[PDB]
């Protein structure tokens, strides 16, 4: 009963077929790119039909009204000959390829598209509320077309664009708790303000309220008062020089003070969600196939060897807990987790828009 | 009769 | 995980109710709550959703307008206010629950609260 | 909207008997369907959901299936804890429309 993705040319002699729109980085392969494509001999004169998986970090909207700026950066591109078939095909075709040439007869060929294990995830910034649909994100994408040769243009009556994503899904082993401390004494007295907080754990899914543990052991002679816990998105965009960008995506805050020589203890409930933050700009998102909503953006996971492996967005969450003391001295302490999905079952151009960039979210 | 800009659909992958 | 709905009963038609669900053993923003009513000898029907998580609540054509659906995020408990309840307002009402990421159907449901007019 | 006509209303089995509950969709939805069993007196129950994948506990005589826009309901082996009303949900677009149900009898 396995089913197949497939779009068609808007002549309708060309179609592609994916069984997968969404392919998994497993941190050292990711899910290959399989597909078919049929194609009508007849329509195809002197044309040989190719397929390219595209990956862009791109700013702006799909259209062509795009007043203003914009951007592009071809992250990877890979291109395939379709028809006529390459002499020489990575890889022998995968059984549902098999079964869908078989299924669609002799006028239907393979192609084969390899990730490479650096690329980003699938990323969206989210546009404010004055941008008029502008959005920075890593975007995959297969386009098929028929052509003379690579160089020749695309043409929109017989090509098919079929957008895809690369994802990524909470590891199945579990991670250190977190756990951060942060002493801050006065000038004359000895005693030291000092607090420790905690996460139950070091990955939550998407929906899943974080418990911080708080815990303040105030020996001096001030008085905190207020307890802060927030949830913050580190957006990472690099390109050429890496920008930081630091989003609040949650905030629990309760007068809960603290009197001087005094413990304190308790256990705090905070949950990341979108309802809250959809007039934010610069909130990173997973990828998007269309105009659907997606949730907030899954950490990115990125492997123990160092290599570059820095490229578009890399997501990233902290819990803060700061706690606001009398005659200043604010001591805060911040708890990196990981936020996912569970496994289911220099050009000129460039630097200008590091720039940008900076200008509009930094 | 259909003019609009094909739609990504499935198809069962069998026969 | 359990799906205890209360607040149903007889009212005059066009008369109005609130139908509390409590919801335990999952979170208000990980899962969407609905709300499916069946009419006596007739099969179900949906009538409202919350998605706490995007904040979104949808309703049935027959339902717009007259009913309002709330959640009460730190309680864990979804709200359905139904208001000028009309002939066609009596069902039992069941509160079900569907993931968030993502819907697969729904997997839990309550018990029904019988609402006559 | 879209309308699933499930068929039949009703039908009369019996244990060990092959029972196909079919269902078709106005519009040509996905594979987002899924499968209740409501008994008398109590509240429905997922058996089925994206049309194919049966729900964690269910026993493993109920099936799902999907031909295009017709999607159907088989127990292989049924049991006498099986005579029940199956309703036919999909859930690809808003409002999620149910199917009319189909009272399995003895």
């Known amino acids: 009963g396995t089913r197949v993705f497939k779009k068609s040319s808007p002549n309708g002699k060309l179609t592609v077929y994916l069984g997968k729109r969404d392919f998994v980085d497993h941190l050292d392969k990711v899910d290959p790119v399989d597909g078919v494509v049929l194609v009508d001999p007849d329509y195809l004169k002197d044309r040989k039909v190719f397929v390219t998986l595209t990956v862009a970090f791109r700013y702006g909207r799909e259209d062509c009204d795009v007043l203003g700026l914009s951007f592009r950066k071809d992250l990877f591109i890979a291109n395939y000959q379709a028809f006529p078939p390459t002499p020489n095909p990575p890889r022998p075709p995968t059984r549902l390829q098999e079964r869908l040439l078989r299924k669609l007869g002799q006028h239907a060929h393979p192609f084969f598209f390899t990730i490479p294990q650096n690329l980003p995830s699938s990323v969206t910034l989210q546009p404010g509320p004055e941008d008029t649909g502008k959005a920075l994100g890593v975007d995959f994408e297969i386009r098929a077309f028929v052509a003379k040769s690579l160089e020749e243009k695309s043409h929109k009556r017989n090509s098919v664009r079929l957008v895809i994503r690369k994802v990524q899904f909470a590891p199945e082993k579990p991670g250190p708790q977190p756990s951060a401390e942060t002493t801050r004494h006065f000038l004359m007295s000895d005693r030291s303000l000092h607090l420790e907080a905690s996460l139950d754990k070091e990955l939550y899914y998407h929906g899943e309220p974080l418990n911080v543990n708080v815990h303040v052991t105030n020996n001096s002679t001030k008085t905190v008062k207020k307890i802060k816990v927030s949830v913050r998105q580190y957006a990472d965009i690099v390109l050429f020089s890496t920008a930081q960008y630091k989003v609040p995506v949650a905030q629990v805050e309760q007068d809960d003070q603290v009197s001087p020589s005094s413990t304190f203890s308790k256990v705090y409930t905070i949950t990341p969600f979108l309802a809250n933050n959809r007039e934010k700009r610069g909130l990173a998102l997973d990828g998007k196939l269309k105009h659907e909503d997606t949730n907030l953006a899954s950490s990115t996971i990125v492997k123990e060897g160092a290599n570059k492996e820095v490229l578009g967005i890399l997501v990233s969450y902290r819990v803060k807990v700061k706690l606001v003391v009398s005659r200043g001295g604010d001591v805060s302490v911040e708890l990196p987790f990981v936020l996912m999905h569970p496994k289911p079952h220099a050009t000129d151009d460039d630097i200008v828009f590091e720039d940008f960039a900076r200008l509009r979210l930094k | 009769s259909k003019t609009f800009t094909p739609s990504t659909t499935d198809t069962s992958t069998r026969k | 995980v359990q799906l205890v709905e209360s607040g149903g009963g007889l009212v005059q038609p066009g008369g109005s109710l609130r139908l509390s669900c409590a919801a335990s053993?999952?979170?208000?923003?990980?899962?969407?709550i609905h709300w499916v009513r069946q009419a006596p000898g007739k099969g179900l029907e949906w009538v409202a959703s919350?998605?706490?998580?995007?904040?979104?609540?949808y309703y049935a054509d027959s339902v717009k307008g007259r009913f309002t659906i709330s959640a009460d995020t730190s309680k864990n408990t979804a709200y359905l206010q139904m208001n000028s309840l009309r002939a066609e307002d009596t069902a039992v009402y069941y509160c079900?629950?569907?993931?968030?990421?993502?819907?697969?159907?729904?997997?839990?449901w309550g018990q029904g609260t019988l609402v006559t007019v | 909207d879209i309308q699933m006509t499930q068929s039949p209303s009703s039908l009369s089995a019996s244990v060990g008997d092959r029972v196909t509950i079919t269902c078709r969709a106005s519009?040509?939805?996905?594979?987002?369907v899924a499968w209740y069993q409501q008994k008398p007196g109590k509240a429905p129950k997922l058996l089925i959901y994206?049309?194919?994948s049966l729900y964690s506990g269910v026993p493993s005589r109920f099936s799902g299936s999907r031909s295009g826009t017709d999607f159907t309901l088989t127990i292989s082996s049924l049991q006498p804890e099986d005579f029940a009303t199956y309703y036919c949900?999909?859930?690809?677009?808003?409002?999620?429309?149910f199917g009319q149900g189909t009272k399995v009898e003895i």
């Open positions: 079900a629950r569907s993931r968030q990421f993502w819907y697969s159907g729904l997997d839990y």
């Open positions: 053993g999952f979170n208000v923003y990980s899962s969407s």
């Open positions: 919350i998605s706490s998580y995007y904040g979104y609540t």
């Open positions: 519009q040509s939805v996905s594979s987002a």
């Open positions: 994206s049309a194919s």
């Open positions: 949900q999909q859930y690809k677009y808003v409002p999620v429309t």
